[PDB]
Write an enzyme that holds these catalytic residues in place. Structure first.
Site, PDB file in Angstrom:
ATOM      1  N   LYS A 263     -32.058 -27.863  14.359  1.00  0.00           N
ATOM      2  CA  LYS A 263     -32.044 -29.099  12.991  1.00  0.00           C
ATOM      3  C   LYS A 263     -30.903 -28.800  12.271  1.00  0.00           C
ATOM      4  O   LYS A 263     -30.743 -28.044  11.662  1.00  0.00           O
ATOM      5  CB  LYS A 263     -33.462 -28.824  12.387  1.00  0.00           C
ATOM      6  CG  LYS A 263     -33.964 -29.795  11.325  1.00  0.00           C
ATOM      7  CD  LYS A 263     -34.669 -29.395  10.187  1.00  0.00           C
ATOM      8  CE  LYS A 263     -33.894 -28.468   8.984  1.00  0.00           C
ATOM      9  NZ  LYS A 263     -33.207 -29.590   8.396  1.00  0.00           N
TER      10      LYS A 263
ATOM     11  N   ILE B 288     -28.616 -17.812   0.841  1.00  0.00           N
ATOM     12  CA  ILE B 288     -29.401 -16.626   0.692  1.00  0.00           C
ATOM     13  C   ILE B 288     -30.832 -16.908   0.490  1.00  0.00           C
ATOM     14  O   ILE B 288     -31.595 -15.933   1.066  1.00  0.00           O
ATOM     15  CB  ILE B 288     -28.807 -15.629  -0.232  1.00  0.00           C
ATOM     16  CG1 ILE B 288     -29.267 -14.083   0.114  1.00  0.00           C
ATOM     17  CG2 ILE B 288     -28.743 -16.234  -1.740  1.00  0.00           C
ATOM     18  CD1 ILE B 288     -28.714 -13.227  -0.845  1.00  0.00           C
TER      19      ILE B 288
ATOM     20  N   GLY C  61     -32.608 -18.015   3.724  1.00  0.00           N
ATOM     21  CA  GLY C  61     -32.198 -17.369   4.643  1.00  0.00           C
ATOM     22  C   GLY C  61     -33.692 -15.979   4.588  1.00  0.00           C
ATOM     23  O   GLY C  61     -34.096 -15.610   5.516  1.00  0.00           O
TER      24      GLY C  61
ATOM     25  N   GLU D 157     -26.716 -16.103   8.782  1.00  0.00           N
ATOM     26  CA  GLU D 157     -25.146 -16.084   7.983  1.00  0.00           C
ATOM     27  C   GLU D 157     -25.589 -16.762   6.890  1.00  0.00           C
ATOM     28  O   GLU D 157     -25.524 -17.999   6.925  1.00  0.00           O
ATOM     29  CB  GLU D 157     -23.976 -16.509   8.821  1.00  0.00           C
ATOM     30  CG  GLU D 157     -22.871 -15.980   8.309  1.00  0.00           C
ATOM     31  CD  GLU D 157     -22.189 -17.198   7.700  1.00  0.00           C
ATOM     32  OE1 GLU D 157     -21.341 -18.066   8.312  1.00  0.00           O
ATOM     33  OE2 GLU D 157     -22.044 -17.372   6.202  1.00  0.00           O
TER      34      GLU D 157
ATOM     35  N   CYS E  61     -18.205 -20.972   3.666  1.00  0.00           N
ATOM     36  CA  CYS E  61     -18.889 -19.733   3.830  1.00  0.00           C
ATOM     37  C   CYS E  61     -17.466 -18.637   3.585  1.00  0.00           C
ATOM     38  O   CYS E  61     -17.918 -17.431   3.084  1.00  0.00           O
ATOM     39  CB  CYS E  61     -19.415 -19.172   4.784  1.00  0.00           C
ATOM     40  SG  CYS E  61     -18.512 -19.253   6.375  1.00  0.00           S
TER      41      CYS E  61
ATOM     42  N   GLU F 292     -22.425 -16.705  -5.825  1.00  0.00           N
ATOM     43  CA  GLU F 292     -21.715 -17.740  -5.103  1.00  0.00           C
ATOM     44  C   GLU F 292     -22.138 -19.011  -5.479  1.00  0.00           C
ATOM     45  O   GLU F 292     -23.257 -19.783  -5.490  1.00  0.00           O
ATOM     46  CB  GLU F 292     -22.470 -17.567  -3.544  1.00  0.00           C
ATOM     47  CG  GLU F 292     -21.685 -18.595  -2.652  1.00  0.00           C
ATOM     48  CD  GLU F 292     -22.214 -18.509  -1.291  1.00  0.00           C
ATOM     49  OE1 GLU F 292     -23.209 -18.741  -1.202  1.00  0.00           O
ATOM     50  OE2 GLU F 292     -21.480 -18.398  -0.215  1.00  0.00           O
TER      51      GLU F 292
END
Ligand SMILES: NC(=O)c1ccc[n+]([C@@H]2O[C@H](COP(=O)([O-])OP(=O)(O)OC[C@H]3O[C@@H](n4cnc5c(N)ncnc54)[C@H](O)[C@@H]3O)[C@@H](O)[C@H]2O)c1
Ligand code: NA
Ligand code: NA
Ligand code: NA
Ligand code: NA
Lengths: 493, 498, 495, 496
Positions: free
Chosen positions: A177, A232, A235, A252, A286, A387
């Protein structure tokens, strides 16, 4: 776009959403609707997962010879190269990055598939010298099973290839996806894979909101591995959901990547690479070098040179050859970058250049944000720790080698970083101490299929690319045969 | 009996190079399940003690005294631990039997295995620092360096305390990690003792740490602390899942081993008496309290009645008693709570319509009345839809199901949430190999049961775990890869305008 | 005192035995040329009997089918005995070979680590599972011990070189027949005594003592040998390989070298001088790794020559047992004579003997096999003194202008064993290292070798490797076992 | 035939197609009818030397040896694709030159495509290792480099197949090579050089010498600029090559045939064992390194087995490799057929029985060719020359054995150790036996199965080293330990 499919691909068929819902896809350059696709349901995702399980148990792909699997993965690689132009254009239309960047992606993607095609038949497992007399011990490596694969919006097809290639090479069945806002190349690669020919259920494409179908992809009992690349927060949520079935996860999640510039660096090289690190794909990478650490003795010289270059960065349409930086991906993402500017100023940092939307007429309708340099900051600040994933870099000074290391390691992340110094011995000392999955010595952004990529700490779990990347898609089985079985006679007769 | 061992055994935690009490001075009484008597009293640590240990492990790791020691020297130290295990084999086995109830003979076999685990990893320590990559980019050098993963927390269960500890400690020390270990609160004796032995070998301060206490008090700190790089847990599924969810807060690596519903597949061309023998071994070693227990017997229909009769007749002869007595074949279960759980499963089995063919209760005999005994049990007339078949009881209990064909055996064996281990018994080795290839299990035994060793990885498919222990793969849980790419002829890209 | 209890015999098929003809040989201390011990001088029939015993033991399976784990434990027990007897072994080695006691202690520490390395590696392979391209087949590669192996060692580092062969052979499950240099058998006899203490099945280990010219051909040419592993000189190596060819027998050869020591003008100067001395003169240059061919950048060549020569004059010669000794004697009269004849060659070709080049006059050195540390200058690559391995306390010095020329000169020899690059510019040292045709390249170091990494030569420096995983692999053989799990008739030939 | 009109007749040295220095030539023959089909250059030893020196020059230039491993892989893959593209013509050439059936030749070409593909894929997958150094402040790494200049000599039975086993890994790793095929069967090797030229390699990286082993062979094995000699052929030439290579301590990789046992137990699938005994004995008229020439059959079924084999051997269809009904073609040359014939005399003089075959066939359409009947020799034992020596013809011996132990002892009782099979429905027993045979490959319930993914080679006098698999590639690599002292200190041993 006239001939591009608008549907999901489930169990060998192109199908609409179970509820007929659709989503409009946008070009971030002008915010115009460019395409409309199915917006699938959680029951569609489940049906794909069940089809992948059924295909896996049939054995048609999972018991195909590894050599043959490699030939098919190679055939995908060849289709990528064959359709390189159209793919690159689609990627630029959907994501906003320059056409030249998109061509480089397509060349890399071809090499990724080719790498894994060639690795497919090169293992199988080990023979073990058993400590028990009259036994044979072997470790067989099998495909892990059914795998779900979730990708982000920054490099859709590149990130997809990192997952698809090893999954197919090892004999897994997969359900993928892509990001809901950038599905075009992923739909296209599915059309190309269908041309190569895979058994029914081996590959499946679900299109839809992560908030609608994501939990089924991470939480279903029939999944053996969830492989996610993105932010994050998502994740962590995914890992918690995967825990419900004790499912393997490969994550990742980006980083706060340090770009360490010593006073004995090649100066003009370092300025060039600080720009590359900071502003390729508008910093939506990234691997972006968002945290510059520069030795104090050259800090002022460095800041001035960098700022002067940042003012010259050419913004525009990814399809125009003179464009050096395109727009950011969405309104939501631009807003997030804007709120970070407020944070940085409230904490006492200086916006040395940029920090706003550009005013120019041809940029007015797009999701543009100026390349930005933030100075007078320190490691305690949110702008340094977090980030931003935009065209923004911070600049901190350091005095000694020890200090550079301490600062670079002072984050929750651990994905990648660089050291610039003509003293290679020093660069190597530093590299050995950085808690990062990848360290570049006198370079930036270099990654390739031959070597594993992934994060220490909160940057991820596991690896993609290389032999280690392929290993995520394998599982070990120890088959121990007693060649002269004897009764133990422990329990009374 | 076991007396002298305990006179000189430490009662404290070991944090940052010192034996220390709990921060709140709390203690816990440790019990012998044979007679439910208190045999020892140890510190019951706090969550602040666990945090201090973690921070000490981080400090030791960053100092580099262990993490930058040569791999060869680390191997020599891991070998010195192995030698201490062997040197103290008798006292360690006796402690383990006193604490866990299993027979002395079983404890000796544990100590032999533990010696071999440490020796295996000692030998592996200096054998693989990474790879040189043939870079696709001209004028670059690409290498992958393998480093210790960092600070690791290690949580072990009560069934095989020292064995499970060794599986975690050996690779952690071999690779250069710092560790914090916490054994089961009800069985800490051998783990304390191994810490004393490691202290004799000598490791930098903070490299090894032992926390003693309730999982519910200190467990979350061990799984959820930001300074942890890997959480390695062996135990039950519920606690495993909780641990994984907590580890997610810091995207921390997890290595889990959570038990199983391990099939023991017996074909009609098996060596019959061998299969009976191994069904008993699979079912009733350590009173079935084994991650590898063969609790789910699948037997071919043509020999099912013959098999059930033979097994039941043997189960009635199993000798229950004190683990220190030579004639004992099966000791007690571990605790009152665990015996109660086994008992409630008997009720479940009957309510769902299975038959308790033999056992299914506490034994009446006088010398067994004070201990936590439960009779070896066989449950018949069941099917795969039943809870008693699907769920891990972890007691001296087996179920027996029939199957008609090879295909049916495979379908039934794979019809569980688990995937840890299993066996196939058949004289037709070709058939056993076909079946083994199709079982979704981390370990398959052909004409054997319970065989595992340091040389080969152990772990589960599906809900039986994540990752592997033992073997090179086990060591790899304690390593992390770094790609160092050097551009030997750097050039400006000149993408951005000048 | 060491010698009072040391065996004087061969060890064949589980027994200490004399030579079949009762012949003996006197062993000498090169420091004073005195006879220190007497040992059996075996026959070719003794060597054959050992080989046949090794074959029998191998086929019995008692060692070759022992578990890899248990084999490792036994190899580890040998390692521990070496350490336990470190002092006596070091003294024996110094007595037999002349090198300093401190050098001998370092050998014994290394030998312990070699055995320990291989003990730890014993049970870590076994082979591979192959993903077969044929449906309904299982393909596996099993690694077995190669079989019966013959092992021949030289006189410079007897026990060290023996360990490199014995450890992997035992670890993998082979049977072995070893023959040390006839002039230096003491520590090898001792290590056989130690191995006997550990216990190995009868015929698994055998020790033959004698002249290469009497028993060598049997060891290299017997049909029951699966591998001949030899370390020594090039002429003997070639002869061995030709003899091994009679039975297509695997060979592992390590034959010395003409090892370049490359010093750039941006080297740490004093470090380079120190290491040029280490390279040239440890064990009186009787080292496979000796840095006998110095290549120094022209810009610093005069500076370098002067500094080296001045240091060479201070090198302290003497008894290996005296703590102040920096260099002992060379090994034998024959070898000293060979070194002497090379001095004549160098002068006849026009090179300059800048310092040394003769026997020392000093009184306490008069009775020993001493030869002065020597520096030969004004030479070039066309000369025999530069191209040929002297294996004595002698270095040549040549100049080079550029990086490219250093590489060209360094690679201009028949050899390819080891070499060094000295430069503070690590990038440059790495470029050079990548282009040298040498099995080992040191960057800012010299003589560093260890069990964890393979050692061996390109070109005429050898075939194969010793040490590391690759060293162990010489003692393994691969077997591909392919099982057809659903066999069908092919029906190609008429029914 | 149309194939031949455009096929080169020359050697390929240093990027150019060249004739022999002395203009000498050789006529190539079709063994089916003994007719001259083509004429090629017969090179000189100076040609071979020039090729070697060109390979060395190319290697030192770095153009191939320093090319990225990924790009080397892509080129090897492009060779693989050309083999498949030209599959039909290559198969026909191979059948014309060697006599074997066209169907066998098609299978070779499929296998050759897979060999190149395997090695293409392996090219960029290593590079070496990082070592955890026992010395503080040092970095230790092992870099795997191409071995260097390699000479490659192939036999006449499977010319292109054997060539591919050598060329693919040599190119994949970055070596320069000089190859010389058998002087009597050069056609497909010339063709593959044309195909490689189309892919494009730096000048001197690949070279093809054509000529008599006795004229140019010594240069190829004995030249100082060679780093590896890789030879596949017979034992006598192998030994001579190894002795010559010793002059420069040059690495050798040898594969020299075998006396391969085919062990049939009384619980084998009987008809499967008969089928595979035929396959083992008679594919390519037994001219196969893997031929199952030594049948060991359990005594209890020996008479039954012999009768069933002999009856099938009489039905084997001999003829033109281009005809679809042909099961076995001719042997390769007059010299080779004569050698096979002399072995029949030997066998009889030693007391063995020629149970069937043992002569040239009489039939009209076979009269002009180099045909020899499929043969079964019975009533023999391990002491006989016919049992111990490789005949490499359409001939099998049959010996009995009583027990499992005796089967193993007999099978191992030869100077060779290349390959063998065990036939038994008791897989446990087959595995026990397999573990004890001193052979590089053991088939359980199969024969002749080999593939790029697994190493092939011999114990004892069957060879040195391996071809195919990762181990095959490793012949073309050399390890270098680079040790960097990152904090160098003076040792101060010698007086200041
Ligand atoms: N894999 C195995 O060998 C194994 C071992 C023990 C139990 N089991 C299974 O699990 C079931 C439950 O066993 P149990 O509950 O007695 O053991 P458990 O699964 O709770 O594991 C025990 C270990 O986990 C620790 N723990 C408990 N809560 C924790 C938390 N929140 N965070 C971190 N650690 C925590 C304990 O203190 C102890 O060290 C059994 O009935 C059996 O089926 C399997
Ligand atoms: Na992590
Ligand atoms: Na799992
Ligand atoms: Na060589
Ligand atoms: Na051989």
């Amino acid at each position: 776009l006239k001939h591009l499919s608008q549907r999901q691909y489930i169990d060998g068929e192109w199908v609409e959403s179970a509820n007929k819902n659709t989503r409009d896809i946008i070009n971030p350059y002008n915010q115009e609707v460019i395409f409309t696709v199915s917006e699938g349901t959680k029951e569609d995702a489940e049906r794909a997962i069940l089809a992948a399980r059924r295909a896996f148990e049939s054995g048609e792909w999972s018991q195909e010879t590894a050599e043959t699997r490699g030939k098919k993965v190679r055939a995908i690689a060849d289709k990528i190269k064959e359709h390189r132009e159209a793919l690159a254009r689609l990627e630029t239309l959907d994501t906003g990055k320059t056409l030249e960047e998109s061509y480089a992606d397509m060349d890399d993607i071809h090499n990724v598939f080719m790498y894994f095609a060639g690795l497919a038949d090169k293992d199988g497992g080990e023979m073990i010298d058993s400590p028990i007399p009259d036994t044979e011990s072997k470790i067989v490596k099998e495909p892990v099973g059914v795998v779900t694969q979730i990708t982000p919006w920054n490099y859709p097809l590149l990130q997809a290839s990192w997952k698809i290639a090893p999954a197919l090479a090892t004999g897994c069945s997969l359900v993928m996806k892509p990001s809901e806002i950038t599905p075009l190349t992923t739909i296209r690669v599915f059309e190309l894979m269908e041309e190569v020919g895979f058994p029914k259920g081996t590959i499946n494409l679900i299109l839809g909101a992560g908030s609608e179908v994501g939990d089924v992809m991470s939480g279903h009992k029939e999944v053996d591995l969830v492989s996610f690349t993105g932010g994050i927060e998502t994740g962590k949520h995914i890992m918690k959901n995967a825990a419900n079935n004790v499912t393997n996860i490969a994550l990742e999640l980006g980083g706060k990547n340090p770009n360490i510039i010593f006073d004995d660096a090649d100066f003009e090289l370092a300025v060039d690479q600080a720009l590359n690190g900071g502003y390729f794909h508008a910093g939506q990478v990234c691997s972006a070098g968002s945290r510059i650490l520069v030795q104090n003795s050259i800090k002022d010289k460095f800041e001035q040179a960098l700022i002067d270059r940042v003012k010259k960065i050419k913004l525009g349409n990814g399809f125009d050859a003179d464009t050096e930086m395109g727009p950011v991906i969405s309104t939501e993402h631009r807003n997030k970058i804007e709120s970070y500017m407020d944070v940085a100023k409230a904490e006492g940092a200086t916006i040395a250049v940029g920090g706003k939307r550009p005013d120019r007429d041809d940029l007015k309708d797009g999701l543009f944000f100026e390349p930005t340099v933030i100075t007078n900051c320190d490691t305690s600040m949110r702008i340094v720790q977090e980030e931003v994933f935009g065209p923004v870099v911070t600049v901190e000074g350091f005095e000694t080698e020890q200090e550079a290391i301490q600062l670079a390691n002072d984050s929750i992340y651990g994905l990648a970083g660089a050291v610039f110094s003509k003293d290679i011995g020093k660069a190597q000392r530093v590299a050995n101490k950085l808690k990062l999955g990848t360290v570049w010595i006198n370079d930036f952004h270099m990654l390739f299929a031959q070597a594993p990529w992934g994060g220490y700490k909160q940057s991820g779990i596991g690896r993609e690319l290389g032999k280690e990347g392929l290993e995520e898609y394998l599982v070990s089985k120890h088959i121990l045969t007693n060649t002269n079985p004897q009764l133990v006679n422990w329990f009374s007769k």
